[PDB]
Design a protein around this ligand. Structure first.
Ligand SMILES: *[C@@H]1O[C@H](CO[C@@H]2O[C@@H](C)[C@@H](O)[C@@H](O)[C@@H]2O)[C@@H](O[C@@H]2O[C@H](CO)[C@@H](O[C@@H]3O[C@H](CO[C@@H]4O[C@H](CO)[C@@H](O)[C@H](O)[C@@H]4O[C@@H]4O[C@H](CO)[C@@H](O[C@@H]5O[C@H](CO)[C@H](O)[C@H](O)[C@H]5O)[C@H](O)[C@H]4NC(C)=O)[C@@H](O)[C@H](O[C@@H]4O[C@H](CO)[C@@H](O)[C@H](O)[C@@H]4O[C@@H]4O[C@H](CO)[C@@H](O)[C@H](O)[C@H]4NC(C)=O)[C@@H]3O)[C@H](O)[C@H]2NC(C)=O)[C@H](O)[C@H]1NC(C)=O
Ligand SMILES: *[C@@H]1O[C@H](CO[C@@H]2O[C@@H](C)[C@@H](O)[C@@H](O)[C@@H]2O)[C@@H](O[C@@H]2O[C@H](CO)[C@@H](O[C@@H]3O[C@H](CO[C@H]4O[C@H](CO)[C@@H](O)[C@H](O)[C@@H]4O[C@@H]4O[C@H](CO)[C@@H](O[C@@H]5O[C@H](CO)[C@H](O)[C@H](O)[C@H]5O)[C@H](O)[C@H]4NC(C)=O)[C@@H](O)[C@H](O[C@@H]4O[C@H](CO)[C@@H](O)[C@H](O)[C@@H]4O[C@@H]4O[C@H](CO)[C@@H](O)[C@H](O)[C@H]4NC(C)=O)[C@@H]3O)[C@H](O)[C@H]2NC(C)=O)[C@H](O)[C@H]1NC(C)=O
Lengths: 208, 207
């Protein structure tokens, strides 16, 4: 079979919040017992970097090894579209495998953020749905959360971003809670994090 | 050797007796040595005699693409009959078999609401009209817009999104000229789904 390489980006929230630590993760699977050594080289815009942290290989339940290398990235490097390449060498390969990742090309556009009460018809159910519209953003990378009185909610589903005709993206998030609370008048908050926002963050609330 | 992928028919094609719903068997990476590809189709075991094979197709990456298309009875697909593509090639280790069928479970009727342009867009050249469609099952659905019978096309629709009760929702966004909205033109969001009466419903709005 021969090894395979997957290269994963940082989470958008981690590149947008200076307090978080964004990482790019290069994962090698199907490493054989006969040729277990795996070498990583990393490059940032084709210049070799030497600060990645590579973990000991780990035997999987199918008897092949998985080996992961992690490169921490500067938030502003990632946001300035630098390109991260992982090159993986292994004696079982005819040649080194390379993977490159970077954020989405294109000019950024600031999302417009709106919230919406439950469909008035829903106003007798066990539960109600709260909506958050996010539209006109570019690039597609974004995080959307819900909180109440500074507490992370979690019963929400968010559509993927949808490419709009204008080249910008939109999506909706739908938080579902107890009928009680919305009348009770608790205040719910939709949080959006995106590179084209001021402080990369904005939040819209609503209640009864 | 080559890969097999087997694709369902389109939701709309199953819901309107005037349309011709098809399952579609695609083979990639067919070389020239054994360009020889055979298909057998079966519905719920019983073999049937009507699939059609396309004129085949080359990618400049050095290989072919060979498609067999079988037309289905609408009611059969909707009742969940299984559809099997059996693919034979003098270049495969063994012949490959794929089954597909409609998502299982009790159909649930969508709820459709249209919503007017936001807030601040009225200063713009253009406005967005919205259609929310929620609570449906299975996820096979078609959503379309029109104005005075005329179909629009300047609209985009999120994919179905799985909700926590195991039903689905989506939104569709139609972009129009501020001028067309303001003259009180009527816009309609149309939804086709097996759990609706006549598989069809339409919701309207205007200034
Ligand atoms: C040489 O090149 C070949 C061709 O490349 C292209 O060719 C042209 C165009 C050229 O310009 C090139 O630039 C192009 O790259 C290579 O062929 C490609 O092979 C790969 C596999 O290696 C294919 O990938 C698969 O894609 C399907 C999705 O289906 C397609 O969508 C893509 C993207 O849109 C598209 O490319 C194809 O067109 C397919 O589109 C659909 O086709 C159907 C077929 O008819 C259309 O439906 C029909 O439409 C009609 C009218 O349109 C009627 O209505 C009819 O009724 C209807 O049926 C439909 O319009 C169209 N849809 C869309 C959206 O476009 C993947 O799903 C598929 O499975 C995957 O499997 C992976 C593992 O193998 C997995 O990791 C993935 O997640 C995925 O799914 C998983 O896998 C399991 C097993 O498969 C599943 O069981 C399971 O669900 C799931 N896993 C889990 C855990 O859930 C696969 O990835 C690729 O599409 C090929 N491209 C083309 C154009 O055919 C070739 O490889 C290469 N060779 C070499 C040697 O280098
Ligand atoms: C033997 O075992 C190993 C290991 O498996 C385990 O053990 C076995 C015994 C069994 O028990 C398993 O159940 C166990 O899991 C098997 O290894 C597996 O190998 C397959 C390939 O054969 C890989 O499949 C790929 O998967 C990726 C998706 O990645 C993730 O998501 C899954 C869950 O869905 C996870 O299980 C994975 O771990 C991985 O999870 C992500 O991991 C990253 C890295 O850590 C995390 O990111 C970091 O997170 C940090 C915090 O945690 C921080 O945020 C960091 O900054 C961040 O970097 C993620 O958070 C985490 N995500 C999740 C949800 O957990 C999938 O993308 C691959 O996708 C495809 O590529 C294939 C080619 O195979 C194409 O067919 C498809 O198109 C598809 O995508 C396209 O691919 C092309 C390139 O080919 C790409 O360029 C295009 O962009 C794509 N196209 C499009 C249109 O988009 C592929 O499916 C498994 O990932 C791997 N598992 C593990 C655990 O590594 C091995 O296969 C077995 N061997 C044998 C012989 O059987």
């Amino acid at each position: 079979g021969g090894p395979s390489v997957f290269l994963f980006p940082p989470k958008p929230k981690d590149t947008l919040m200076i307090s978080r630590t964004p990482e790019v993760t290069c994962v090698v699977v199907d490493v054989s017992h006969e040729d277990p050594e795996v070498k990583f080289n990393w490059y940032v815009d084709g210049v070799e970097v030497h600060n990645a942290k590579t973990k000991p290989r780990e035997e999987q339940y199918n008897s092949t090894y998985r080996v992961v290398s992690v490169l921490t990235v500067l938030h502003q490097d990632w946001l300035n579209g630098k390109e991260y390449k992982c090159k993986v060498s292994n004696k079982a390969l005819p040649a080194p495998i390379e993977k490159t990742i970077s954020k989405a090309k294109g000019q950024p556009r600031e999302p417009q953020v709106y919230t919406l009460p439950p469909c008035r018809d829903e106003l007798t159910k066990n539960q109600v749905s709260l909506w958050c519209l996010v539209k006109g953003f570019y690039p597609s990378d974004i995080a959307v959360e819900w909180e109440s009185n500074g507490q992370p909610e979690n019963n929400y589903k968010t559509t993927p971003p949808v490419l709009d005709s204008d080249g910008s993206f939109f999506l909706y998030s739908k938080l579902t809670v107890d009928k009680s609370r919305w009348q009770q008048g608790n205040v719910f908050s939709c949080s959006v994090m995106h590179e084209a926002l001021h402080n990369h963050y904005t939040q819209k609330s609503l209640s009864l």
